Write a structure and sequence with these properties.
One of its GO terms (cellular component) is RNA polymerase II transcription regulator complex. Keywords: Deafness, Disease variant, DNA-binding, Metal-binding, Nucleus, Receptor, Transcription, Transcription regulation, Zinc, Zinc-finger. There is one protein chain. With about 250 residues, the protein is mostly helical. It has 13 helices and four strands. It has a four-stranded mixed sheet with strand order 1-4-3-2. The protein binds [4-(4-hydroxy-3-iodo-phenoxy)-3,5-diiodo-phenyl]-acetic acid (4HY) and arsenic (6 copies). The site of [4-(4-hydroxy-3-iodo-phenoxy)-3,5-diiodo-phenyl]-acetic acid has 17 residues, from helix 4, helix 5, helix 7 and helix 8.
Length: about 250
């Protein structure tokens, strides 16, 4: 903990300390419990009819918002199982959640990318294509998520890495309106540090793994920001009635 810089300067790659291993277990379990069973959506997935999602294709949009509420609640459930999140005020809770929701949902869809069928599986239950997701309301956001998915294939991420990534997205102190900024940053730094150490232990046969991984954090933030804009365009090209209450609550002030 106190011998970070010096440990790096020598050339050693510090692995998780006992305190961090404990933190890693909590976050991983948090993710695993609120996410689909690994390597299961593959056999249980259902491809969306090729005729849907071939303006906003309201039919495809319909199919997506039908399962969007559970996807969102899974993210709240994840956040709930992290003590650091619970230590925070109600106002900060909501702000943090409204800001990372689409970032985490996208990472989750992205890691369930299948190069064979060239599809993503939403909620591990609905296999969709780039065009289908694009026409269903996401526009270029679909492109961004699929591009992310194709890229993540080489990273070979496990439940721990995806979980830590989600924790880093969640604890974003720059979220506007936050009140407990400096402690939300302490939490994030803590996650980032356990994360880097986890990566050293994992030793991916990939060059500059950590920095490349960090760039993904930025891409996920962009996907989120970009989706905020896609939501505005949705409220115009879509019947207000096809917007589940929680969907509206989380993305719009
Ligand atoms: O797969 C998961 O667990 C989470 C997940 C669930 C869904 I439904 C999803 O698609 C979206 C997201 C935002 C949006 O405005 C529209 I219309 C569709 C994505 I991307 C990810
Ligand atoms: As709680
Ligand atoms: As509140
Ligand atoms: As509470
Ligand atoms: As505070
Ligand atoms: As974009
Ligand atoms: As955009």
């Amino acid at each position: 903990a106190a011998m970070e810089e010096l440990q790096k300067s020598i050339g050693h790659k510090p692995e998780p300390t006992d305190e961090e291993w404990e933190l890693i277990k909590t976050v991983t379990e948090a993710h695993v419990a609120t996410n689909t069973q690994g390597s299961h959506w593959k056999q249980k997935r259902k491809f969306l009819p090729e005729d849907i999602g071939q303006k906003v294709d309201l039919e495809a949009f319909s199919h997506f918002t039908k399962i969007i509420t559970p996807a969102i609640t899974r993210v709240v459930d994840f956040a709930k199982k992290l003590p650091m999140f619970c230590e925070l005020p109600c106002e900060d809770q909501i702000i943090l959640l409204k800001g990372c929701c689409m970032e985490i949902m996208s990472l989750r869809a992205a890691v369930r990318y299948d190069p064979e069928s060239e599809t993503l599986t939403l909620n591990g239950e609905m296999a969709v294509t780039r065009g289908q997701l694009k026409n269903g309301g996401l526009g270029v956001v679909s492109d961004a998520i699929f591009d992310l998915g194709m890229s993540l294939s080489s990273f070979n991420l496990d439940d721990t890495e995806v979980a830590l990534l989600q924790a880093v997205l969640l604890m974003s102190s720059d979220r506007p309106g936050l009140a407990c900024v400096e402690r939300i940053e302490k939490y994030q730094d803590s996650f980032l540090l356990a994360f880097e150490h986890y990566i050293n232990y994992r030793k991916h046969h990939v060059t500059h793994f950590w920095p490349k991984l960090l760039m993904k954090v930025t891409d996920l933030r962009m996907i989120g920001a970009c989706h905020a804009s896609r939501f505005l365009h949705m409220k115009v090209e879509c019947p207000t009635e096809l917007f589940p209450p929680l969907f509206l609550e989380v993305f719009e002030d």
